[PDB]
Each structure stands twice: as C-alpha cells, then as structure tokens.
Amino acid sequence: STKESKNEKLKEDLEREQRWLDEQQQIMESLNVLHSELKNKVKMLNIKEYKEKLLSTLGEFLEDHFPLPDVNLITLHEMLEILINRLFDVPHDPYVKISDSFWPPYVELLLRNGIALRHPEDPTRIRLEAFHQ
Amino acid sequence: PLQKRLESVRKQSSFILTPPRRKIPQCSQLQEDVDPQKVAFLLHKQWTLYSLTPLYKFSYSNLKEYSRLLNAFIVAEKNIKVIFSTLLGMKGTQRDPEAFLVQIVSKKVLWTGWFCCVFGDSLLETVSEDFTCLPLFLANGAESNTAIIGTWFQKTFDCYFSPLAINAFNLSWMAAMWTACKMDHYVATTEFLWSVPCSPQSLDISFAIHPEDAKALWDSVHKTPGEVTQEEVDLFMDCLYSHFHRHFKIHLSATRLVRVSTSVASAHTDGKIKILCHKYLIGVLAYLTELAIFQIE
Amino acid sequence: QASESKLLEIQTEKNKQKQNLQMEIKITTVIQHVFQNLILGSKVNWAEDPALKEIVLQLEKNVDM
Amino acid sequence: EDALQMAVGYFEKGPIKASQNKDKTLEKHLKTVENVAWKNGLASEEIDILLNIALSGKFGNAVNTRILKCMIPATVISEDSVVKAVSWLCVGKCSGSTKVLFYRWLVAMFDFIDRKEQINLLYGFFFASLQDDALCPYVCHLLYLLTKKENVKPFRVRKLLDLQAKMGMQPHLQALLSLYKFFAPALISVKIYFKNSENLWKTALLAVKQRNRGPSVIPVLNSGSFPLEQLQSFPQLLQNIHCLELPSQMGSVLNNSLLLHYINCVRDEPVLLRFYYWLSQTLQEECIWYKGKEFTNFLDTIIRAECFLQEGFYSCEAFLYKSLPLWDGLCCRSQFLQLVSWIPFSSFSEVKPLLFDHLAQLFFTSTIYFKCSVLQSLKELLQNWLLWLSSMNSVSKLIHYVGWLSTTAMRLESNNTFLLHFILDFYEKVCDIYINYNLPLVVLFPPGIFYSALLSLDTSILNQLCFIMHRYRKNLTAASKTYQEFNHYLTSMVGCLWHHPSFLSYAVSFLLQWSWYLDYLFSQGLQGLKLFIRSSVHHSSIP
C-alpha cells in the first residue's frame, strides 16, 4: 500500500514539476525578449510632432464646434493663443485685459470649463489655468 | 550576505555557555537631553511589554504623516487625536536609534506607546541600513487601542509585537539586580509574590522585607563588589527559602514567582513594569532590552 | 542559475543608464488640458467621430517621457 | 433569431409609438434579457449594445436602470464598449442616478474588462467628475483601482488637495490621496473599504468566475512601476516583470505564485530578512497558539512553497532547531518530517550536536513506521543535497551515520523486513552518485545489512539486492578496499546462488506443473534477476 501511495504521489509531483517547468519556460522567453528590447532601445522631435498634431486637431475641433456668430471679434483660437502666450511670457502676471473683441460667450465658456480664471479684484482681466503645475 | 552570518551566529547560540556576570548599575542622574517632565509622566506608571522585529523604512522626520495615518485608521475602525513626539537621551549607545512616543489625546491622554532600544547592538550588528531597530515597546492604556495600533503597525512596517514573558530565573536575577542598587530614599519595601500551581485558584503568597533588612542581607550575601553573579542570586534565594521554611516549614521553592517589587521598580511575569526612580531607569531598559533580543533570536 | 544571472545583469544595466524643450513640454501639457476641458464642455459624443476618438486617446500622455 | 437577439433588436430600434400593448412587449423583452443575464450571463457584443443603449437618451430611466442592473458578462467585457460608455456619459443626456449606477457597475465589473489601458487613457474624464459631489465617492473608488504612477500629475494632486480642503478628509478622498502619496511622495509634501460598494450584480456564476479570477494567517495584500493589484494574469507578469514593486507584506507571495516567480530571482537582501522575521514570528505564534487544522494547512502551504524555489528556508530551520528537543514526535509529525528534507547543505559537524542527536533520540525509541518515515526524510535530504551540489567528507559522514542507524534499528526490530525495504530503497537512491551528479564518490553499505538481506527469506529482497549490486558494479566499472569488499561480496552471493529457500514456492509450482526451470522464474517477473545474471556476474553470460 505504501508502494502504490508513493507511486501516485510521484506521479502527482512529476505532473507539478512539468507544470512549473512549462511556466518558467515562457517566463524565460519573456525575460530574454524584454532584456533584448531594452538592450536594443539603449525626444525633442517627438514632442514637437505631438504638439503640432494636437494643435492642428484642436484648431479644427474649435472651428467645428465653437464658431463665431457670423465690432470686430477674434476667433476663440486667437484668444486661447493670447492666453497661452501671456501665461509663459509673463509668469508673474499672466492676466490679459478683456477687450471688446472678446466674445463674452467665449469668455464664459472658458470660465465654466476651468480653462480661464478671473482676477480676484479686476473683472476686466482673466488668466489661463496653469495646468503644467 | 547578512543572512548567512546571522544563521551562523544563531547556530552558535546554544544553552551551553555560562551565564555572564552583570555589572551593578550606579546612581546616575537623568541626562541633559532627558526632559524631567516627560520621564515623570513615563515614570510612576504601568507599562506592558512587547518585543518587536526591526522597523522597515522608518523615518523620524515624517512624524505628522504617521500621526494622520493612525488617525485615519482609527476613524476607519470607528473627538480624539494622535500625537507623535521625539524623546532624547534614553538610548544606550549612539548605535541605538532615537526613541519616540505616541499619545492618544481626547479633545486627557488615554493611550501611550513607547518604542526604544537600550544597549541593544546584537540586533543592530545583524541588520542592514534600511531598518530601524527599536525592538522594545511599552504600552499604557486600553487594550483595544493597543490592538488597533498593533494592527496598523503590522500593515505598515511588516512587523509584529510579541507579548514578552519573564520566567522565574530572569525575575529573580533582576530582583537581585535592583536590590544591589543603592537607593538614598527607601520609599518602598521590597515585596515578592508567588502563585501555587493549581487549576482552582489557590493561595498566593506575598513576602515583604524591610529595606534595611533586605540591604543588610544582600551585603551579607554580596561577594563581588559592583557585580552580580549567579551564585549570589542562588544564595539570595536559598537564604529567603531557608528563612521561610524556618518560619513555617513550607517549601516556598516549589512555587512559581510571579511578581517582584522593590523600592526602585517592580516587575510581573505577564509583562507589567512599574518604574519609580529615574536614577537607574536607563539601566533597567538595557536589561529588559536583552530579553527582546532573546525573543527575536 | 541562468535566470538569476540574467536578472542580475539586466538590473545592473538598468540602474546603469539611470530654454526651448522644457517650456515646450509645459506648453504641450497646457494644450492637452485645454483640449480635454473643451471636449468635455462641448458635450460631443467624441466616440462617434473617429478622428476625435483617436485623438482623445492621445491625451493623458506624459510629455516628459 | 433567438430569444435574446429579438430583445436586442427591439432595444436597438429605440422607443416606439404610444402604448397599446407596447408596455407588455417592452417588459417581455427586458425580462428575457435579465433572465439570460442572471442565468448564465451576456456576451460581449450584446453588452456593448445594451450598455450604450441604456447610457443614451433613448428609453426612460426605469428601462436604463434595469438594463444596467442586468449587465452581467458571461465571459469578458470589451474596453471599447466602456470607451463608448464614457463618451455617452460625456454627452450629458444621462440621468444622475444612471451615472451613479454606471460607476458602481464599472467598479464591480473591473476585473472582467479584457484590457484597461484605453480605459486608463480616459483618466482625465474620470478625474473631472470629482467636482460632482453626487459622483465623488464612486469616482474616487474607480480612480483608486484605475490609478497608475503615470496618472499622478501635479495638477491633479493640487486639485485633489483643494477638493479635500473643501469637503474635508472624506474616506474615499483619503484613500485616493494615500494612493497618490504612494505613487508620488515628492509632490505631496510640496484593499480599502468604500461606502455603497455592495456588488449589485453578484450572481452565482459571476461569483464562480470571480473566484476563478484568483489563481489572518496570510496578510491581506496592500499594493513607471506596475501596480501589484493589476497583476491578475500571467501575460501581465510576463510584460511587467522588470518594473515590479515589492509588496509592503510578502505573506501573500506564498499563496500567489505570480509574485513567487519574481521572488525566485530577485535575490534581494532586505526582503530576505523581512520574510525571515515574518515567517519566524508567525511560526512561533502559531505553535504557541496550537497548545490545529489551520496550523496543519498553513504548514502544508509552506511545504508546497518550499517545493518551489528548489531551496530551503531558514525560518523553518530555526523553528525546527528550537522545537525538536521539545518535540514529542507526534504533534505534527507529517509536517515536521517534510521540512528536514529541505535543509541547507552544511558540514556534518555542527548539525549533529544540535539536530541529529534528538533525531537519533526519537529514532531509537519511536515506532518502526516512524523509523521508515525518518529514513524517507533523510533519503530525500540526501537527494536534495546532491541536486544542490551538482564537502564530500560531509556526505560521507552522513552516509556512515545513517548506515549506523540502519544496522542498529535492523537489529532492534527483530530483523523486520519492513524497515529493510526502506534501507534498500535509500541505498538504491545512493548508488547512482557518479552517474547522476558526476561525483567520484561511492560508499558501501555495512556487511550486516548485506548478510541480513542477501540470505533473507523474501524474494523481492533478492530482486532488489540483485539490482543494487548490478548498479554498484556498473558504477564501479564506470570509473582499494572498496574493490576488495565488492569482490568478496560477489564471491559470497555467487556461492549462495548457482537451492535458495525463498524460491521453494516457485519449486512447488514447478512440482504442480523441464531441466531448465529458470525460464519459469523469469516469466514470473524476475527481470532484475536477468539483468544481474546477464550483465554483472559474467560467469554465465548466456541465459
């Protein structure tokens, strides 16, 4: 009876051994391929391509979903450009004065969606939310 | 690495070497960095002992983060606040890490926890740089709070508290150790407590000796000056047993010692510690610090 | 043994490698956030527009990578 | 069609005209869907259809609520369906209760989405919903599962801190903020319960699939490094093995083979001490609390893990050293005897004073079956040591010691062949050192066992002796006093062999049924005898 019991015990242990061997196999190929990929692998132009693609698609989206109705109003694209330019040109005073060329619906749209922020005291000035920090 | 030599050193750790003699602590005033008010709060209070594995990635700077994390855990379990403080001057050596206190204040402190290590270097000699070795924990407060704090520490630092136990041999040794200490003001007569082993609760002998008589008997059975030896402890116990048997013809030697109290401090087998005199306080910790190591190893 | 050696060597080498560009990274992050907030404010079913859908998934990319 | 596809088409047609019998028709279709959903589940395509139909403006709030409450997958959920669902949420023509129910569903069905990377790409849309205080707890619970290290941006940390200041230290906010602190500690200084997280979609089949999705004695696991919670599939580990992060507690590594794969090669010093102290104190507390079934199961799990890693642990070694002198021999004998098999290789001069002395103490006084047990344990130890090595004085002394125990016990039990079988099996495992591990070391069994077994009264004993001397001769010819003793033994058995009392049985059969009767013995099944008499003795090579 011990002889049978050890026979099936060894059979079970052998099956478990093949299971572990199989698993560690694909473990080994995965580790080796990852090591080779890292060895073969070892920025500015990528970021530039992304930025230009993002900007072009954003401009098309704005023209398709936020058009002017027809004083001389400026496009929402120019308004966003002014905001972004002042945010980084004057990091100590990123507020731009609201002129008559700013369509009030555009200003309220930028305010509702957390994009633009109002000056604590001066209502004629808005700034861009510093998302980079 | 450290594991191999650690294996070797606990392989060498066998109950074959003779128990080394211990140097009697001397009257030492509280250190300059030691705040008298903090220890005065610590002294004259009851503490429960816990042995701890070395902390993993413990920093003394982000104490407020720990306090808020414990507060969040407590409110998750459920007008209380958790305060972390850093206590200076109670490390045995420069190797021993800085000690700190944790308090629960009901906006009246209800639960206090002390993490410390005095003269404990064997654990510090077998540890890497990442860990912090404060294997001694003293708890004072409700058991539920202690369990909650232990659960938080187990989840956070990957460690446990183990209730440290003291046998009759160690308790008799420490009894001799403090009765060797010189106290200018004998404000508490020495007292021993026993418990006969019986399934129903039975007689619990309490034996008290006047401090002058105890000191005289000690000096009579004191041979090596400034040091305590196993023969001294054995003769001390034998003299007490002979006195008891001469009085009552009862073999106290067949009874379990459970609590020993003297003028400076008192100890109980379950892990209760009471401290009265600061002059030997630090040394006290060192001795019990060895027991944490002896429980870790 | 082979796997231990391989992991050791890969870990060792991995630790071994360890005004225009920075401001352009910041500007690209700002543009990402502005585009996302505008898409959210427009309430457009951007999954219906294939280009808008493939561009929405272009957002949430760390520019400093 | 089929019963469900009719309902899917009916819902794709949108709402119809004024109700004459249309209420009953809609009810029948919805009842068919939920019945199929609560019996065995829905396919990915049907879910992709119905989820986006419910999250659209079509149909009332009750229909959408029931559809959401019956969105139970039979296998997986496509991530493109979730992307379209997030787009429908962005549309805005969705009810607030419907949005809450959808976030609850996304949290409950998180482990059933085939891929989550495109969903993680919508982290901005998910995070912008924190402004809504009706969706705030559910959105926090979703972000707690979805957040990776790349998503913890400074703007989001600042906005989450402002939201915490506005709402107070809410539990969900605190959980998400603790995750953010774990991922980015530098931006902060400059297994969590959530309320209303009851699984509304918990059918029985979804339960068996959730339990199949997982391939206190063991601590509950608590978490561009790959998050540990996201590790739920073997390909995920294959892809993210390099960027793994060590857990706060590694006890869950024992019952999770995924982390064991990285543990097998991490070779990290601090985690060694951390697991050593962990398992040692766990063993101490379990042992002191025992004085049982849970302890046995825990030790069985430890043994199963020990079968892996092809190397022994040290916490178990220290525990067994401490407890062996106190060991009675019957508390958890099955558990103890399997740990001695995995003992690190050491010189045979320090283990004997501390370990093998009490082993002999038990061996000389315990049951004969316990003797066979410890024999099996020591032969397994010998196998493990040879496997690890593939020095020689240590194994030679171990073999001499076990042989002394063998002969002493063989005398002890009035020469019981039950232990002799284990002795001989152990010696067969020994006899292949040179040919199995390329070690030029052969040790010879004591003559007492030789004479007791060779002229014993059992035929299988004769069989395995013939086998063992054949293997010894093969090993000897493969590569001074050893050869002399071997030749003396060969002369001894050739004198004993060509009769033998053990074969009288066969002879009686030969009387029941031919000068050459060895062929009948051979057909009876003595193939080891053919091997020995044909390839070892060589005196009569022909049969």
CB D88 within 8 A of CB C43: no
Assess A33–C contact: CB distance below 8 Å, yes or no. Answer: no
Angle among Cα A101, A107, A108 to the nearest 5 degrees reads 140
Chains B and C touch (3+ CB pairs under 8 A): no
* Range list of H helices, chain C: 2-17, 20-42, 50-56
Kind of pairing, strands A125-128 and B161-162?
unpaired
Interacting residues of B38 by C-beta distance below 8 A, sequence separation 6+: B85, B87, B101
Taking CB atoms and an 8 Å limit, are C34 and A28 in contact across chains? no
Rounded Cα distance, A109 and D74, in Å: 44
Of D413, D381, D406, the C-alpha closest to D395 is D381
Q: Tokens at residue B211, please? A: 């401090």
CB C44 within 8 A of CB D90: yes
Q: What is the CA radius of gyration of chain B?
A: 21
- CA separation, residue D470 to residues B73, B182, D528, D536 (Å): 70, 80, 9, 6
**Which residues on neighbouring strands pair with residue B265, listed in sequence order?**
B275
How many Cβ atoms sit within 10 Å of the Cβ of residue A115?
22
Of D281, D217, D325, D280, the C-alpha closest to B164 is D281
Chains A and B touch (3+ CB pairs under 8 A): no
Rounded Cα distance, D362 and D358, in Å: 6
Interacting residues of D108 by C-beta distance below 8 A, sequence separation 6+: D199, D200, D201, D202
AA identity, residue D509: S
DSSP of chain B, one letter per residue? Answer: -HHHHHHHHHHH--TTSPPPPEEPP---PPPSSS-HHHHHHHSSSEEEEEEEPPEES--SS-HHHHHHHHHHHHHHH--EEEEEEEE-S--SSSSSPPEEEEEEEE--EEEEEEEE-SS--HHHHT--SSEE---EEEEES-HHHHHHHHHHHHHHHS--EE-----HHHHHHHHHHHHHS--SS--S-EEEEEE---SS-----EEEE-HHHHHHHHHHT--STTEE-HHHHHHHHHHHHHHHHHHH---GGGSEEEEEE-SSEEEETTSEEEE--GGGHHHHHHHHHHHHHHHH-
By CB atoms closer than 10 A (0-12, 13-18, 19+), residue D237 is buried
Q: Tokens at residue A11, please? A: 């059979």
Q: From which experimental method does this structure derive?
A: cryo-EM
Region of D308 on the Ramachandran plot (φ > 0 left; ψ -120 to 50 alpha; else beta)? beta
Helix/strand/coil for D431: coil
Interacting residues of C65 by C-beta distance below 8 A, sequence separation 6+: D150
Assess D110–B contact: CB distance below 8 Å, yes or no. Answer: no
How many Cβ atoms sit within 10 Å of the Cβ of residue A49?
10
DSSP of B90-132, one letter per residue? Answer: --SSSSSPPEEEEEEEE--EEEEEEEE-SS--HHHHT--SSEE
Taking CB atoms and an 8 Å limit, are D155 and A24 in contact across chains? no
How many Cβ atoms sit within 10 Å of the Cβ of residue D117?
9
Rounded Cα distance, B162 and B50, in Å: 5
AA identity, residue D436: N
Among D171, D273, D353, the residue with its CB nearest the CB of B76 is D171
CB D167 within 8 A of CB D140: no
Residues in chain C whose beta carbon is closer than 8 A to a beta carbon of chain A?
A: 2-3, 6-7, 9-10, 13-14, 17, 20-21, 23-35, 37-42, 44, 51-52, 55, 58, 61, 63
Assess D387–A contact: CB distance below 8 Å, yes or no. Answer: no
Q: Tokens at residue B100, please? A: 């700190």
CB D94 within 8 A of CB D57: yes
Q: Tokens at residue D2, please? A: 């089929």
Assess D56–C contact: CB distance below 8 Å, yes or no. Answer: no
Helix/strand/coil for C6: helix
Taking CB atoms and an 8 Å limit, are D121 and C62 in contact across chains? no
Rounded Cα distance, D474 and D467, in Å: 11
Taking CB atoms and an 8 Å limit, are D238 and A24 in contact across chains? no
- If contacts are CB pairs under 8 Å, which of residues 115-174 in chain B contact chain D? 127-128, 130-131, 154-156, 158-160, 162
Phi, psi of B99 (to 5 degrees): -100, 155
Q: Buried (b) or exposed (e) across D361-394, using 16+ Cβ within 10 A?
A: ebbeebeeebbbbbbbbbbbbbebbbeeeeeeeb
* Range list of H helices, D308-391: 315-323, 333-339, 351, 357-363, 368-389
CB B172 within 8 A of CB B240: no
Rounded Cα distance, B46 and B262, in Å: 15
Angle among Cα B164, B168, B173 to the nearest 5 degrees reads 95
AA identity, residue B261: S
Q: Buried (b) or exposed (e) across B233-258, using 16+ Cβ within 10 A?
A: bebbbeebbeebeeeeeeebeebebb
Phi, psi of C48 (to 5 degrees): -75, -35
Rounded Cα distance, A128 and B193, in Å: 77
Rounded Cα distance, A15 and A8, in Å: 10
Of C63, C50, C23, C56, the C-alpha closest to C37 is C56
Rounded Cα distance, C29 and A133, in Å: 9
Region of B119 on the Ramachandran plot (φ > 0 left; ψ -120 to 50 alpha; else beta)? left
Of D398, D399, D422, the C-alpha closest to D410 is D422
CB A97 within 8 A of CB A124: yes
Of A69, A82, A133, the C-alpha closest to A110 is A82
Rounded Cα distance, D38 and D32, in Å: 10
CB contacts of A57 in chain C (<8 Å) are: 35, 51, 55
C29: Cα within 13 Å, side-chain hemisphere: 22
Rounded Cα distance, B177 and B226, in Å: 10
Closest approach of D441 to chain A, Cα-based (Å): 27
Closest approach of C41 to chain A, Cα-based (Å): 6
- CA separation, residue D82 to residues C48, D76, D115 (Å): 14, 12, 10
Of D496, D484, D492, D478, the C-alpha closest to D439 is D478
Rounded Cα distance, D424 and D430, in Å: 10
Chains contacting C (3 or more CB pairs within 8 Å): A, D
- Tell me which DSSP letter residue D113 carries: B
Chains D and A touch (3+ CB pairs under 8 A): yes
Of D442, D460, D451, the C-alpha closest to D505 is D460
Sign of the torsion angle spanned by Cα atoms C55, C56, C57, C61: positive
Rounded Cα distance, B155 and B160, in Å: 9
Breaks in chain B (C to N over 2.5 Å), named by the residue before each, are 78, 107
Q: Tokens at residue D454, please? A: 């060779």
Q: Tokens at residue A78, please? A: 């120019």
- CA separation, residue A46 to residues A54, A128, C33, C47, D391 (Å): 12, 26, 19, 26, 60
Helix/strand/coil for D300: helix
Taking CB atoms and an 8 Å limit, are D265 and C48 in contact across chains? no
Please give the helix or strand (H or E) that residue D7 lies within, else none.
helix D3-12
- CA separation, residue D488 to residues A102, D481, D493, D533 (Å): 113, 10, 9, 17
How many Cβ atoms sit within 10 Å of the Cβ of residue D226?
18
- Tell me which DSSP letter residue A96 carries: E
Q: Which residue of B has its CA nearest to D249?
A: B158
How many Cβ atoms sit within 10 Å of the Cβ of residue B40?
12
* Range list of H helices, D40-74: 44-54, 61-69
Of B249, B62, B198, the C-alpha closest to D186 is B62
- Tell me which DSSP letter residue D304 carries: H
- Tell me which DSSP letter residue A25 carries: H
Interacting residues of B62 by C-beta distance below 8 A, sequence separation 6+: none
Assess A90–C contact: CB distance below 8 Å, yes or no. Answer: no
D512: Cα within 13 Å, side-chain hemisphere: 7
**Which residues on neighbouring strands pair with residue B257, listed in sequence order?**
B194
Phi, psi of B227 (to 5 degrees): -145, 150
Residue with tokens 């050459």: D516
How many Cβ atoms sit within 10 Å of the Cβ of residue D257?
17
Rounded Cα distance, B132 and D273, in Å: 13
Please give the helix or strand (H or E) that residue A125 lies within, else none.
strand A125-128
| 3-state SS string for A35-89 | HHHHHHHCCHHHHHHHHHHHHHHHHHHHHHHCCCCCCCCCCHHHHHHHHHHHHHH
Number of H helices, E strands in chain D: 32, 0
Of B145, B176, B136, B109, the C-alpha closest to B273 is B136
Rounded Cα distance, D340 and D358, in Å: 13
- Tell me which DSSP letter residue D435 carries: H
**Which residues on neighbouring strands pair with residue B49, listed in sequence order?**
B138
Please give the helix or strand (H or E) that residue A128 lies within, else none.
strand A125-128
Angle between helices D79-91 and D44-54 (to 10 degrees): 10
Closest approach of D466 to chain C, Cα-based (Å): 38
- The gap from C-alpha B48 to its chain's centroid, in whole angstroms, comes to 9
Rounded Cα distance, D506 and D518, in Å: 10
Resolution in A: 8.9
Taking CB atoms and an 8 Å limit, are D249 and B162 in contact across chains? no
Of B269, B293, B242, the C-alpha closest to B118 is B293
Rounded Cα distance, D65 and D68, in Å: 5
CB contacts of A23 in chain D (<8 Å) are: 234, 257, 261
Angle between helices D79-91 and D96-108 (to 10 degrees): 160
Of D333, D321, D326, the C-alpha closest to D296 is D333
DSSP of D438-500, one letter per residue? Answer: ------PPPHHHHHHHHT-S-HHHHHHHHHHHHHHHHHHHH--HHHHHHHHHHHHHHHH----
- Tell me which DSSP letter residue D354 carries: I
Chains B and D touch (3+ CB pairs under 8 A): yes
Rounded Cα distance, B52 and B99, in Å: 14
D237: Cα within 13 Å, side-chain hemisphere: 19
- Tell me which DSSP letter residue D191 carries: -
Q: Tokens at residue B14, please? A: 């066998």
How many Cβ atoms sit within 10 Å of the Cβ of residue D316?
23
Residues in chain C: 65
Residue with tokens 């693609």: A53
Sheet holding A125-128, edge to edge: A96-97, A125-128, A116-118
Chains contacting D (3 or more CB pairs within 8 Å): A, B, C
By CB atoms closer than 10 A (0-12, 13-18, 19+), residue D165 is exposed
Rounded Cα distance, B293 and B20, in Å: 16
Residues in chain B: 297
Chains contacting B (3 or more CB pairs within 8 Å): D
Rounded Cα distance, B253 and D301, in Å: 45
Taking CB atoms and an 8 Å limit, are A109 and C41 in contact across chains? yes
Closest approach of C34 to chain A, Cα-based (Å): 6
Of D288, D277, D348, the C-alpha closest to D314 is D277
